[PDB]
Design an enzyme around this catalytic site. Structure first.
Site, short mmCIF file in Angstrom:
data_model
loop_
_atom_site.label_atom_id
_atom_site.label_comp_id
_atom_site.label_asym_id
_atom_site.label_seq_id
_atom_site.Cartn_x
_atom_site.Cartn_y
_atom_site.Cartn_z
N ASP A 36 -2.42 5.58 -5.20
CA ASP A 36 -2.70 4.65 -4.11
C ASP A 36 -2.91 3.20 -4.55
O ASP A 36 -3.97 2.85 -5.04
CB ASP A 36 -3.91 5.18 -3.30
CG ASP A 36 -4.12 4.57 -1.93
OD1 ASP A 36 -3.32 3.69 -1.54
OD2 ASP A 36 -5.10 4.96 -1.25
N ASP B 5 0.76 -1.25 0.00
CA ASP B 5 0.00 0.00 0.00
C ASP B 5 0.80 1.32 0.00
O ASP B 5 1.37 1.69 1.03
CB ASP B 5 -0.93 -0.07 1.23
CG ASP B 5 -1.89 1.06 1.40
OD1 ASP B 5 -2.34 1.62 0.38
OD2 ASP B 5 -2.25 1.36 2.54
#
Ligand SMILES: CC(C)[C@]1(C)CC(=O)N(Cc2cccc(C(=O)NCc3ccccc3)c2)C(=N)N1
Ligand SMILES: *[C@@H]1O[C@H](CO)[C@@H](O)[C@H](O)[C@H]1NC(C)=O
Length: 339
Positions: free
Chosen positions: A225, A37
């Protein structure tokens, strides 16, 4: 310090919304399914100390420090407040294996894991690929620690996210630590510098919906992201965008009548010198073409609070189309057409 190691981790694609790979924690290793992430900077997995009254802990793999000889106690409280929910627990240290690289890492042992959203999670935990500036409890992120070993050819990491095939022979995705995989992109990389070090966020020059609709007209921000499923904008931006598409708002997503899906206009994101275009096939979950069925969009609203937000977020919807390289040495992001 730079070496010559490139380490690749194979990812599993769960329904085009969750991409996760495996890491091993402790001696002997306890394996976990983790999201790599760029929108967070902490490593965490569910803990054996998580009350079984948190049902998400019953349905996930839990770390047991009592079974690890390499474990080093810390105990400092840790609260990670994300856009999708909050996880809470304490700090622990152990050896983590990620694609062949072994690193001593400070990570969070989560003891409070809400059923919403974590009962929908196919992964167990998270590997924050963000900078130390956004690390909760000022914990050194895993990539910084890997850099300290001076084994990587380059101070970069790359993501490839595939389209959800039902075939088992299909690679869900791949993260390369230390470089990029030319087998999963074509043409050349086009780099956009970071607004500032500490966030995988760049300047966006404008957002176009077909010919007539225009958004981000005076410029905006784009957080790249890897842990977000969809492309996201502010509630206001998404209201204008969805009006232009003829999409209807529901509780958590936006839909179109399935038959109308293949007719929707192209959406273009102006980043650096290039326009990054997604066709309806790229953002519509075309589950059918029925006039009697509703089809979800891989675009939603998400009001990200300051200092990071207000911002757009380019999640898995974007990365599937564009192979992404996160360059730490130069504080920039590179995009190339994925294959
Ligand atoms: C992974 C995720 C829980 C978290 C740690 C916390 C969070 O809110 N985001 C943004 C965010 C916004 C909107 C939706 C989601 C989502 O549905 N993600 C699922 C997911 C999991 C793996 C890969 C892609 C997507 C995440 C992250 N960047 N990381
Ligand atoms: C936890 O780790 C940090 C690392 O800087 C350290 O300062 C702190 O003393 C540790 N806490 C305990 C109780 O070991």
């Amino acid at each position: 310090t730079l070496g010559n190691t490139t380490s690749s981790v194979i990812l599993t694609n769960y329904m085009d919304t969750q991409y996760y790979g495996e890491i091993g924690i402790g001696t002997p290793p306890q394996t976990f399914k983790v999201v790599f992430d760029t929108g967070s900077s902490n490593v965490w997995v569910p803990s054996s100390k998580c009350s079984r009254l948190y049902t998400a802990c019953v349905y996930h793999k839990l770390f047991d420090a009592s079974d690890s000889s390499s474990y080093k106690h810390n105990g400092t409280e840790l609260t990670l407040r994300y856009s999708t929910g909050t996880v809470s627990g304490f700090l622990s240290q152990d050896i983590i294996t990620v694609g062949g690289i072994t690193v001593t890492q400070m990570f969070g042992e989560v003891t409070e894991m809400p059923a919403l959203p974590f009962m929908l999670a196919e992964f167990d935990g998270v590997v924050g690929m963000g900078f130390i500036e956004q690390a909760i409890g000022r914990v050194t992120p895993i990539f910084d620690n890997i850099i300290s070993q001076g084994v990587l050819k380059e101070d970069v990491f790359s993501f490839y996210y595939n389209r959800d095939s039902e075939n088992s022979q299909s690679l869900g995705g791949q993260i390369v630590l230390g470089g990029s995989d030319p087998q999963h992109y074509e043409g050349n990389f086009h780099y956009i510098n970071l607004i500032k070090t500490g966030v995988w966020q760049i300047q966006m020059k404008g957002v176009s919906v077909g010919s007539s609709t225009l958004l981000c007209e005076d410029g905006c921000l784009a957080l790249v992201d890897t842990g977000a499923s969809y492309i996201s904008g502010s509630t206001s931006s998404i209201e204008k965008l969805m009006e232009a598409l003829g999409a209807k708002k529901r509780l958590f997503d936006y839909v179109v009548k399935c038959n109308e899906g293949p007719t929707l206009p192209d959406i273009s994101f102006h980043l650096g010198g290039k326009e990054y275009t997604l066709t309806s096939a790229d953002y519509v979950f075309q589950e059918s073409y029925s006039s009697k069925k509703l089809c979800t969009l891989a675009i939603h609203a998400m009001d990200i609070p300051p200092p990071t937000g207000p911002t757009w977020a380019l999640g898995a919807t974007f990365i599937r189309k564009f192979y992404t390289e996160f360059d730490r040495r130069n504080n920039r992001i590179g995009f190339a057409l994925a294959r």
